[PDB]
């Protein structure tokens, strides 16, 4: 049962992208309403939820129909949390940032021998803004981003 708080958010976003301010949103729109909320259903998985409620110009969903769809994917997962704990783990030192130094230092205790070369590697591909380190933000990305 999406919590009220968890609702106001799906409207503050559902609406924020309903350009022709009515009360329903296009398919493409739905994709955007989502990604913005931090998610990105496949350019094909994005139609399963919508195709299931074909009582519109066929390709449009109101608010109440979206408030529902946000179940099939959400009435189970509660992983956002754990992933934030993992982060606090590698961030060994406490700088809110995960340095390649520590990426390795932790990667080696869980039994994995990493090359001082291939670590700088990951750390690199994980950083999106260039500071050579990873923060929770980009870390969340790396992880969940399938």
């Amino acid at each position: 049962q999406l919590t009220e708080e968890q609702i106001a958010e799906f409207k503050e976003a559902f609406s924020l992208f309903d350009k022709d301010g009515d009360g329903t949103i296009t398919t493409k729109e739905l994709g955007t309403v989502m990604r913005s909320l931090g998610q990105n259903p496949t350019e094909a998985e994005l139609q399963d939820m919508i195709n299931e409620v074909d009582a519109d110009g066929n390709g449009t969903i109101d608010f109440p129909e979206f408030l529902t769809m946000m179940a099939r994917k959400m009435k189970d997962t509660d992983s956002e949390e754990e992933i934030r704990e993992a982060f606090r783990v590698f961030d060994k030192d406490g700088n809110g940032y995960i340095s390649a130094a520590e990426l390795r230092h932790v990667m080696t205790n869980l039994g994995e021998k990493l090359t001082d070369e291939e670590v700088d590697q990951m750390i690199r591909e994980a950083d999106i803004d260039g500071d050579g380190q990873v923060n929770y933000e980009e870390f969340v990305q790396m992880m969940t981003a399938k």
Partner: protein, 735 residues
């Protein structure tokens, strides 16, 4: 801690090739001693007189024992020691010369000594027979009454056998001798003069070079940390206030070690410790009555709530009972009530502990009764003889807060089932947390899964894959039939604890019934003192919510151990609407981060539920929509910042392509914030967002070029009609 300090790189490779030649002749340790001693050596330029940034007033000249003879002509010195807390060696050098008449360096050498004498061994642990005895060799050990170099104006005193008798009187004097003994052992010229004259002091210093120095330099090192540590009380000093049952703590001592993991408990109540060792079972999840802290019942969970900590609170009793009753109603067969029975020992304890006072005997219905007394003025208590049952009633002139009035009745305490028999319930051991080592968790994943993951070619994939493993097999906490909400490894850790105190001779069941208080998300409690049992097996008891959060950063957090803290910290806990703070790293860096698309939208949502006015109203005003279109505009940039396709670019670019991305965001914010009426609640949020974007962009600058400031770089753009060259501009804007 860099000991040497050269204030002026003036003179050529000669002041330098001279300061060096000096220091390289002193043992790498005499220094490591001076360093740990917080000393610092000062090699400035020419600063003869009190001109050195440290040659002012602090702890200067007071009494005249001064050099390799005394002289106190300050205007004529080049080497100095700031004696009082921390030693400060201060030396200068003029033109090319110390090697011709070395008698000039013998000072920068002794001048030092007084850096380590009085703190050396001479008086450093205390005078220890080592030196003390070596001093006795005034003249009666070796056939060498030669010490006309260190002992004259003060020690031409052969007439009195020098020992503990008077060696203290002149501590400084026995320094003026150790210092030369040192000057001579290292002076780049007169080496043997020592070995030739005084035969002992040589072999003394000699054994100092041989290791003697690496000694103290390790008695200060170790007494370096154990000196500036965290006040925690350890040993059976804490284990006292802790509350745990001693034989139990120790029993635990074993598992911490074997399984290598820190165990942390909240305060177990004192009035229950023995009851526990005694054999009394512990309160589980099934019961929610309040313990009691007075009268006999004390430490037991009375079926009557007006006989526990909440005596008088018409509501917590009138709601306490509601629970006991239900506790039995629901979980019948396991949760019941049984008549109180304070055994033999328990009594003599509520004695001095100051809870009851045994006395005046009495008879009633032909049975022997000892009127147990107390100061509580609402009930009367008394205990049987055959069976030592306990009974009470209201007094002949008073009434219950609930309004009841009853005569002598047995005091039923609460009790759970244990091997078919109901035993009375008392306080249990509530874990504040469990810190297993990251390696023990590795031993938790099945060798084939963790194997099937590191073969993945994709490095980025290998990181993710691993993390979810660590998460999966060691961070994830699910609910559980009996033991509340906890981790799996946590559960196994739970049993090993119980089975542990079970062989220690317990007979009341388990003593750890549920998970770690770091999952008590609903009604989190904040205890000051927290008993701990490290992996080595010591006992520690923080004193503060702080200390704990600190003793943990220092040993559990940043030390290869896996710990996670209450999801409700730094938030208001639904259940009891409580706010318990805990240093969270992630949040410690929000200050310098360009919010997320979704973190942004979320924030608006929030404020909408409070000022009941959204960033933009659903109206027809073409001014509103403008504001709308404009947040959508930020909700765009903001996520554009965190685009995962940033991998195909090079670091340099990343910062750039983003410093901009973010900049665009700052723009549109600025825009709106200079728009129509936007509730002053957003006015602020949006203001807060700025400081961030700013901060984040400044960080993305100090990684690249350095003078460039935000406020400026921004000023220098043109977001009027075209964004075209605006960006190219931005590049050059960085040269």
């Amino acid at each position: 801690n860099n000991l040497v300090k050269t204030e002026f790189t003036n003179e050529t490779l000669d002041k330098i090739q001279q300061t060096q030649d000096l220091l390289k002749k002193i043992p790498k340790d005499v220094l490591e001693i001076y360093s740990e001693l917080g000393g610092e050596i000062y090699f400035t330029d020419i600063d003869l007189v009190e001109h050195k940034e440290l040659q002012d007033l602090s702890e200067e000249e007071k009494n005249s024992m001064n050099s390799r003879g005394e002289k106190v002509p300050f205007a004529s010195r080049f080497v100095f020691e700031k004696k009082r807390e921390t030693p400060k060696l201060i030396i200068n050098i003029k033109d090319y010369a110390i090697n011709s008449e070395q008698s000039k360096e013998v000072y920068y050498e002794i001048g030092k000594g007084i850096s380590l004498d009085i703190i050396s061994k001479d008086k450093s642990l205390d005078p220890e027979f080592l030196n003390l005895i070596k001093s006795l060799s005034d003249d009666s050990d070796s056939s060498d009454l030669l010490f006309s170099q260190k002992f004259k104006e003060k020690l031409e005193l052969n007439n009195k056998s020098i020992d503990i008798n008077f060696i203290k009187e002149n501590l400084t004097e026995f320094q003026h001798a150790f210092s030369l003994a040192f000057s001579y052992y290292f002076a780049p010229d007169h080496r043997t003069v020592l070995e030739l004259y005084a035969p002992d002091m040589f072999e003394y210093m000699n054994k100092l070079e041989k290791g003697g120095f690496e000694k103290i330099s390790e008695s200060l090192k170790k007494e370096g940390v154990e000196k500036d540590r965290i006040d925690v009380l350890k040993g059976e000093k804490a284990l006292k206030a802790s509350g745990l049952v001693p034989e139990h703590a120790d029993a635990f001592k074993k598992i911490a070690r074997e399984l290598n993991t820190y165990i942390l408990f909240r305060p177990v109540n004192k009035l229950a410790t023995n009851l526990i060792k005694s054999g009394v079972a512990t309160k589980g999840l099934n019961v929610h009555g309040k313990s009691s802290d007075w009268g006999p019942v004390a430490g037991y969970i009375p079926f009557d709530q007006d006989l526990s900590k909440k005596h008088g609170q018409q509501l917590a009793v009138e709601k306490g009972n509601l629970e006991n009753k239900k506790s039995i109603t629901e979980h019948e067969g396991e949760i019941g009530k049984i008549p109180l029975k304070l055994d033999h020992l328990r009594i003599e304890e509520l004695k001095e502990n100051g809870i009851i006072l045994k006395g005046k005997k009495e008879i009633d219905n032909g049975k022997k009764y000892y009127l147990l007394e107390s100061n509580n003025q609402v009930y009367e208590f008394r205990i049987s003889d055959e069976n030592n049952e306990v009974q009470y009633k209201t007094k002949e002139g008073k009434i219950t807060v609930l309004g009841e009035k009853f005569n002598w009745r047995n005091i039923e305490v609460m009790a759970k089932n244990v091997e078919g028999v109901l035993k009375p319930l008392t306080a249990d051991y509530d874990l504040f947390a469990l810190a297993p080592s990251l390696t023990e968790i590795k031993k938790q994943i099945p060798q084939k899964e963790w194997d099937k993951v590191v073969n993945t070619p994709n490095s980025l994939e290998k990181q993710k894959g691993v993390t979810n493993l660590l998460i999966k097999y060691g961070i994830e906490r699910k609910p559980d039939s009996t033991k509340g909400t906890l981790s799996n490894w946590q559960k196994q850790m739970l049993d090993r604890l119980n089975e542990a105190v079970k062989y220690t001779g317990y007979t009341g069941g388990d003593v750890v019934n549920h998970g770690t208080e770091q999952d008590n998300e609903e009604f989190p409690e904040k205890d000051n003192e927290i008993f701990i049992i490290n992996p080595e097996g010591e006992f520690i008891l923080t004193k503060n919510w702080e200390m704990t959060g600190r003793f943990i950063e220092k040993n559990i957090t940043g030390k290869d151990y896996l710990y996670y803290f209450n999801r409700s910290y730094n938030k208001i806990a639904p259940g009891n609407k409580a706010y318990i703070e805990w240093t969270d790293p992630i949040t410690k860096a929000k200050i310098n981060t360009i919010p997320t698309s979704a973190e942004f939208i979320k924030n608006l949502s929030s404020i909408r539920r409070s000022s009941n006015v959204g960033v933009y109203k659903d109206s027809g005003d073409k001014d509103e929509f403008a504001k709308k279109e404009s947040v959508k505009k930020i909700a765009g940039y903001l996520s554009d910042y965190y685009n995962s396709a940033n991998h195909i670019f090079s670091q340099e670019k990343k910062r750039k392509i983003s410093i901009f991305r973010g900049i665009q965001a700052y723009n549109e914010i600025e825009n709106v914030l200079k728009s129509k009426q936007i509730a002053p609640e957003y006015k602020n949020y949006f203001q807060y967002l700025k400081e961030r974007i700013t901060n984040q962009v400044q960080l993305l600058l100090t990684h690249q070029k350095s003078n460039i400031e935000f406020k400026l770089l921004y000023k220098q753009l043109n977001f009027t009609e075209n964004e075209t060259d605006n960006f190219e501009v931005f590049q050059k804007i960085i040269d």
